[PDB]
Amino acid sequence: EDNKQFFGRHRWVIYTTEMNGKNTFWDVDGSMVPPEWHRWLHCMTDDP
């Protein structure tokens, strides 16, 4: 979470590779953030 950019580039995420065996170094999906980070990253709060 950066405080330099504007509203919409506050929070972003970097996933990892093969969290369920996908070779997902490339072509990452959605539905991978656990839902406390869904509360965080979708800006439904101001709390980590």
User: 27 near 15, Cβ under 8 Å?
Assistant: no
Q: Which residue has the tokens 């990452």?
A: 28
User: 19 near 32, Cβ under 8 Å?
Assistant: yes
Q: Could you give the string, one character per residue 2-21, with x where binding to other proteins holds by CB under 8 A and - elsewhere? A: -xxxxxxx-xxxx-------
Rounded to the nearest 5°, which phi and psi values hold at 9? -120, 30
Please report, as residue ranges, which positions from 19 to 48 form the binding site for other proteins (by CB under 8 A): 28-31, 35-36, 38-39, 41-47
Whichever of 20 and 44 has its CB closer to other proteins, that residue is: 44
Contacting residues toward other proteins, per CB under 8 A: 3-9, 11-14, 28-31, 35-36, 38-39, 41-47
